[PDB]
Design a protein around this nucleic acid. Structure first.
Ligand SMILES: Cc1cn([C@H]2C[C@H](O)[C@@H](COP(=O)(O)OP(=O)(O)OP(=O)(O)O)O2)c(=O)[nH]c1=O
Ligand SMILES: [Ca+2]
Ligand SMILES: [Ca+2]
Ligand SMILES: [Ca+2]
Ligand SMILES: [Ca+2]
Ligand SMILES: [Ca+2]
Ligand SMILES: [Ca+2]
Ligand SMILES: [Ca+2]
Length: 901
DNA sequence: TCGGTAAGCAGTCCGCG
DNA sequence: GCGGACTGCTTAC
């Protein structure tokens, strides 16, 4: 097999690399890598090296990496550009793996771990590590085993061994319900004392050294805790054994409000799963507890235990250990579903970076572009300092707030990367500038043609047309990967709908789910077999189709994110190729494209309808348009349609056979106007929306920019078994909105769009009557909580104190003098409830850590004093008033002359 | 929250005769 | 009461 790296580090004048050799073995080597950098040279000097602008460069070979770094400094002192890859480990990887890397995940040691630490005096701070580590569960992907290290004797209590037999039993048998499928994979090791536990853990770590290290909050908690605890007990040298090269560094992570410390383990790639999840999941959750996320992702119930976690080991060590094991497994289950580790390996190996660098698109693109240019003996420019400067982005049309009955939407494929490719936007393809007219003049095609030679953007920029720039070349490669995975995602989605349809008529039989590849549209044969399957088999197939859809979604949306990241990286001062000329060329072209096609679509539809100045495009945001289809439907007449699906088919056909060709013609003209390199503005139909045929549903409504709801029957070619609400921006979509309130508002919207005013009024009346019975957590608001300290004046709200911060301050007074009470953590999320006048808490609201029950110390008083009237008005009525006024509907029945009867 | 812009709503403070 | 200036937070793209 072809070799591939696992990890790489620079330590002084050495590269330390762990890798898989040609025989599939893990090896480590130390290499005295001599790096090269570049200076510009006279044209009279023969060279094969040229900078991206075609200027000749001489290669400087250094005796060692320190010399190269010192040279960079002296070049700054002189005032001359020092060209080339200054991150020498990336240059090392580029030289050592000068081919497309094919990696074998089965040879990569991926470790998932979690620790337990009993703490009687509050949160056990990892920088202090003053409490014993009393459990570690460490799963190894190569062994496929959960290694459990269990401390039996501690100053906080001596306990009996954990029982695998009790662990396996149902919770109804008094067991812990450790999943049967991992029971045979547990290797249990009890310890007489913590020193022996940790010494054996380190020996184990030496034998089975993680390449990828993950878990939940491992970077912020588990790793620094283990490191600092071992340091405290044994000294620094022993703690550094967590690194295969015995090198660690405290790294200070800074944000706007303060800083925190993590431990960098040289020769390990830490991918904390909480951070993978935050980056790659495209959710915003009210809590990031593993409990909360596991329930969301897997539909597994909360891990139940009595009393505080600080007393769990002494009261129920059996459950304590089982829950530690289950916690590690839950992350594995989340990854089996989401496949973020797979994604990270794919992207990291593609770019030729340390795997942990996938968190940074700037670093990822720096490496991709460097490797690409190096192939042509081209030389990358030096990174430079730039002041942060604001620049313009997308256009968003102001909609007329209203109901909108029939709506077809259209959206441009991968807009920003497609603009880069079409215009040929790259650092080295800049050709010059032209004199700009107001944007409106380009939109209406009255401005003079910018250039007859170069490819243009309406920001004034001109680009070469003779050859693709490196940015277009490389962005295209990742776009093509994205397109492939999106194809799989949509097939799995369509396949899912086939199965949902079949589930209307399940067969009474005992059978098996079909062995099929859900990434490809089901054949006629598979379809016929599905129609004969039991509900059991169909539901299993549906689960599998949905899992395939999720895998496709991960792979496509994050490749989309990567390529979009390149567009914005051009506007990030830390990117080697930062250039606001290029960043603005993208965004300004985007504004033009949207408003240009708005004009073209209005002109086309006024022509088909035989009208003048009528606005068919009701809304657009960045690269989408929403078209009112009422007039199209009315031209055949609602009474001609057999059912909802009939008019959906009709609009689908109209969009594909009439509108898309018109749109294409409009964009081809725009391409010629800007003299672009290649026409790549592909705007395809997205949604078909409307009320069910014969209903009083309103179909859709807008309240303003980025705030709308549509009843969708078909989305990008997926014809739904049941209509799906597409709601954007409204409170149903906001993590700050109480859970039960999101649910209620969604049902109000569903009724509005599908059933009509009377249905809405019926539901509103019921919700208003019954909502006080809702669990307090389900009706609590949610907010991130920053700068608690800033607004804290002696335990009380300072000037301009935000509402949620006031709530935290109230909580802090109510729990004062309790080291055991859960503390609100700066920067994390809280639940927030309003409090009635005259409550014992002395203020109008209270807040506590999100994803948790409020401490029993104050729970009953919170429940007693919760202000239901305020909560309802703020989170439910006010947003509903907004929806209904926009939709020109009433949520309460108005008096009429009929009431006299 | 270590890892591009546009733009909405909650809430504080305070004006608005 | 509502709206502007401002802070804070959140989502759409
Ligand atoms: C969603 C999203 C969009 N954008 C920018 C870049 C996108 O090209 C542009 C339009 O957004 P989108 O229409 O959401 O995405 P897209 O056009 O890139 O891809 P798709 O084929 O799925 O429609 O907005 C971001 O910068 N970050 C983001 O997270
Ligand atoms: Ca735990
Ligand atoms: Ca798009
Ligand atoms: Ca059937
Ligand atoms: Ca879009
Ligand atoms: Ca098309
Ligand atoms: Ca203070
Ligand atoms: Ca206001």
């Amino acid at each position: 097999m072809k070799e591939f790296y696992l990890t790489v580090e620079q330590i002084g004048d050495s590269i330390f690399e762990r890798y898989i050799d040609s025989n599939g073995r893990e090896r480590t080597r130390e290499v005295e890598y001599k790096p090269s950098l570049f200076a510009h040279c006279p044209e009279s000097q023969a060279t094969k090296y040229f900078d991206i602008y075609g200027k000749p460069c001489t290669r400087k070979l250094f005796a060692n990496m320190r010399d190269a770094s010192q040279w960079i400094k002296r070049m700054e002192d002189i005032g001359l550009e020092a060209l080339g890859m200054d991150d020498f480990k990336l240059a090392y990887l580029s030289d050592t793996y000068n081919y497309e890397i094919k990696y074998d995940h089965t040879k990569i040691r991926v470790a998932n771990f979690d620790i337990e630490v009993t703490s009687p005096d509050g949160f056990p701070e990892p920088s202090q590590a003053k409490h014993p580590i009393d459990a570690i569960t460490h799963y190894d992907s190569i062994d496929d085993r959960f290694y459990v290290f269990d401390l039996l004797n501690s100053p906080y209590g001596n306990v009996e061994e954990w029982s695998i037999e009790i662990a396996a039993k149902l919770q109804e048998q008094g067991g812990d319900e450790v999943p049967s499928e991992i029971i045979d994979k547990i290797i249990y090791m009890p310890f007489d004392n913590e020193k022996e536990l940790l010494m054996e853990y380190l020996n184990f770590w030496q034998q089975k050294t993680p390449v990828i290290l993950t878990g939940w909050n491992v970077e912020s908690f588990a790793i620094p805790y283990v490191y600092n605890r071992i340091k405290n007990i044994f000294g620094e040298s022993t703690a550094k054994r967590l690194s295969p090269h015995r090198k660690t560094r405290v790294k200070v992570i800074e944000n706007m409000y303060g800083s925190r410390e993590i431990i960098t383990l040289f020769g390990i790639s830490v991918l904390d799963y909480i951070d993978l999840y935050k980056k790659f999941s495209f959710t915003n959750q009210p809590s990031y507890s593993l409990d909360y996320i596991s329930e969301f992702e897997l539909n597994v119930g909360k891990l139940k235990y009595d009393g505080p976690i600080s007393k769990l080991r002494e009261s129920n060590h059996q459950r304590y250990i089982s829950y530690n094991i289950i916690a590690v497994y839950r992350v594995l289950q989340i990854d089996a579903k989401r496949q973020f580790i797979n994604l990270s390996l794919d992207m990291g190996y593609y770019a030729k970076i340390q795997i942990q660098s996938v968190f940074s698109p700037i670093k990822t693109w720096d490496a991709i572009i460097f490797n690409s240019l190096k192939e042509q003996n081209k030389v990358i420019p030096q990174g430079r300092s730039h002041p942060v400067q604001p620049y313009p982005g997308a256009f968003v049309k102001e909609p007329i707030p209203n109901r909108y009955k029939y709506v077809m939407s259209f959206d441009l494929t991968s807009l920003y990367p497609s603009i880069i490719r079409q215009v040929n936007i790259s650092p080295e393809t800049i050709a010059g500038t032209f004199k700009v007219a107001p944007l409106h003049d380009y939109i209406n095609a009255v401005a003079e043609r910018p250039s007859d030679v170069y490819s243009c953007s309406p920001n004034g920029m001109m680009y070469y047309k003779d050859r693709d720039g490196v940015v277009p070349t490389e962005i295209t490669k990742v776009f093509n990967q994205r397109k492939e995975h999106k194809g799989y995602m949509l097939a799995a989605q369509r396949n899912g709908e086939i199965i949902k349809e079949a589930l209307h008529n399940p067969n009474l039989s005992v059978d098996e789910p079909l062995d099929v590849d859900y990434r490809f549209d089901f054949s006629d044969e598979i379809k016929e077999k599905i129609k004969k399957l039991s509900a059991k088999s169909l539901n299993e197939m549906l689960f599998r189709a949905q899992r395939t859809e999720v895998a496709g979604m991960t792979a496509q949306i994050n490749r989309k994110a990567l390529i979009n990241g390149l567009a914005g990286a051009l506007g990030n001062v830390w990117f080697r190729y930062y250039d606001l000329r290029n960043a603005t060329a993208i965004t300004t072209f985007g504004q033009m494209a949207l408003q240009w096609i708005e004009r073209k679509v209005n002109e086309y539809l006024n022509e088909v309808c035989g009208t003048e100045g009528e606005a068919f495009v009701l809304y657009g945001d960045t690269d989408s348009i929403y078209v009112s289809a009422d007039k199209i439907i009315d031209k055949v007449g609602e009474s001609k349609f057999r059912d909802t699906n009939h008019w959906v088919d009709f609009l689908d056909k109209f969009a594909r056979e009439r509108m898309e060709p018109a749109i294409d013609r409009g964009f081809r003209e725009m391409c010629e106007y800007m003299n672009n390199k290649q026409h790549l503005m592909f705007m395809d139909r997205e949604a078909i929306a409307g009320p069910p045929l014969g209903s009083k549903g309103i179909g859709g409504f807008w309240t303003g920019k980025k705030r709308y709801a549509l009843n969708v029957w078909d989305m990008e070619g997926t014809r739904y078994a049941e209509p799906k609400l597409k709601i954007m921006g409204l409170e149903t979509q906001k993590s700050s909105t109480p859970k039960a309130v999101q649910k209620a508002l969604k049902e109000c919207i569903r009724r509005m769009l599908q059933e009509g005013e009377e249905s809405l009024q019926e539901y509103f009346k019921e919700f208003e009557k019954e909502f006080r019975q809702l669990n307090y957590i389900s009706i609590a608001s949610v907010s991130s909580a920053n700068n608690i300290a800033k607004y804290d004046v002696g335990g009380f709200p300072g000037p301009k104190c935000p509402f949620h911060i006031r709530g935290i301050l109230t909580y802090n007074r109510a729990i004062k003098g309790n080291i055991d009470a859960p503390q609100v953590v700066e920067g994390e999320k809280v639940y927030v409830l309003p409090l009635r006048e005259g409550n014992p808490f002395g203020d109008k609201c209270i807040a506590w850590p999100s994803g948790t029950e409020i401490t029993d110390l104050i729970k009953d008083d919170v429940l007693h004093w919760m202000d239901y009237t305020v909560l309802l008005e703020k989170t439910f009525i006010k947003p509903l008033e907004g929806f209904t006024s926009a939709a020109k509907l009433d949520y309460e029945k108005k008096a009429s002359l009929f009431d006299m009867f």
